[model samples]
Target chain A: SNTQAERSIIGMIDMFHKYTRRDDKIDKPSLLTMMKENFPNFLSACDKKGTNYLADVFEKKDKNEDKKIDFSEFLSLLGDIATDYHKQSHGAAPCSGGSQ
Target chain B: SNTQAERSIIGMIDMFHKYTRRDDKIDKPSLLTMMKENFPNFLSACDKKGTNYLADVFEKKDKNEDKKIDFSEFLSLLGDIATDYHKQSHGAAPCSGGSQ
Candidate 1:
């Protein structure tokens, strides 16, 4: 589907363009605008820095750290967490394991 | 797009049906027909337990001791795998991590 395809590449490019530390080709305004539109609540949460009654360790993802974040980075933050669930639920050979 | 929507939900369902340990709530003939119409290669691989000379090790995905495989269980595997790619590219806290 287009959504998956978008996530697979377009989304990644968008994020890499926006938040990526790659300053040589920074498209800051447009990129930041994209993330803000897509994730209004997330951008708000990124500003908080502390542990409240139920503190959210949630910070917007910015791999390049140019102060912006986008979809692939967001997904990388959430989706990758699922991987841990897999490891805990099962066992694999020391470090090397994969699909056939 | 309908395609992404299908990949998002229906694809997961189909995969879950084909590979989970759950027994059939339906008939094998129907499921086999659907799979034949869909994932011919995956079924062939499952039937063969075939390996990649380059190195493959996917034979460890059995949660229960039933010879049969179902759909939800299958997503439980790949979905979780996708979750991992999300994580490795980011970080999790003491209990791993989360999103905003």
Candidate 2:
């Protein structure tokens, strides 16, 4: 029902490169800074709501334990965040399970 | 650099509920209709460029083949789309591999 929602997947691709500087991988500093800067609302939402949403977020998302984030890892990060938000919106638990 | 990109993952949660109507799953009709209506740009791009992008999209995305799309399946669909677009944007192969 929303055009904005539809472009999100494509928009993420463009945004990744804008910060990645044409590289396939985003370094640790770049990843955290991007998330901190771009997702202020979410971070603020976390603080206001008293949830440590950003607590150890980077480690939790680095499934491969690699220092840098590739496109796949980035998608997983978004997927996890989206999943939690979806659940909470639906009256379910927030991030109930680990990598389900 | 894009605050828009940050909200996308959250925005998708809202949009999904708007279509899902309190259901945890989206039936084929609802899913396809939403995709068609919202993602016209991607569809149009495919048609204009002579690529069978939507051809077998449902089958390809129905990973569990349960006849309905759950949240996990939906995320996978978006992941594939984002991955393809990302690769294309970066001069790599387009949707090069299967569910990587």
Candidate 3:
């Protein structure tokens, strides 16, 4: 009886736990593996647009500079990709009003 | 040919825009309305648990005290609920990890 929203959220949790096996946090390699598995198309899009998304991504995503990507930080990264797609849907990717 | 993850993220964006039409943000009323509609079951669970989730939820979510739920803020709210569910899945709601 779970809703679609709930199910999707569960999928996110499941994916995160799948990679963050050693500890509760995900390191750089695991995070990259996740983006490769779940966001192949998105990575390609970043390349096509010359956005250089992969470069310094962990540096950007690791907001606290702790060298570990926690679940909230993981969601922040996903939020960015989702925001980019939202921008693409709206004709032009406006610099403002998106997850940064 | 969007993936499941992309589609779920799109659902999130669509849900945000559905309530944020007045501006690029959602105010108190609209945010409550969206939560009531989309998170009916979750709200019920919160009440049953005596978590008093709705109380000060907006206050907690409006991190900048802006009184407006921007897209990033909206995702943060969703991230909380999703984190709660993730904790529930892991048996003790660990109070250590998840989206908070």
DockQ for every prediction shown? 0.05, 0.56, 0.53
lDDT of 1 by residue, B1-100 (tens): 2322223333344333443333432233443454444444433444454433112112233345343333333434343334433443454211121334
Listed per model in order, the count of residue pairs whose N, CA or C atoms clash below 3 Å is 17, 0, 0
Which one is best on lDDT?
A: 3
- In order, the Cα lDDT scores of the candidates are 0.37, 0.71, 0.77
lDDT of 2 at B57: 73
Q: Given candidate 2, what's the lDDT at residue B87?
A: 69
Ranking by TM-score: 3, 2, 1
Candidate number with the higher TM-score (1 or 3): 3
TM-score of the A chain in candidate 3: the value is 0.86
List model 3 lDDT by residue over A24-90, tens digit each: 8899898888887888787777777676666777888899998999887988887787777667667
Q: Is the docking of candidate 2 incorrect, acceptable, medium or high quality?
A: medium
Rank by DockQ, highest first: 2, 3, 1
Compared with the true structure, what per-residue lDDT tens digits does model 2 show for residues A1-100? Answer: 3278557876787667766745578877787787777777666656765776656777777789877778888888888767767767767654453454
Ten contiguous residues with the weakest lDDT in model 3 chain B: B91-100
Error of 2 at B64 (Å): 2.4
For all predictions in the order shown, the interface RMSD in Å is 9.1, 3.5, 1.4
Best by TM-score: 3
Candidate 2, after superposition: displacement of residue A33 in Å? 1.0
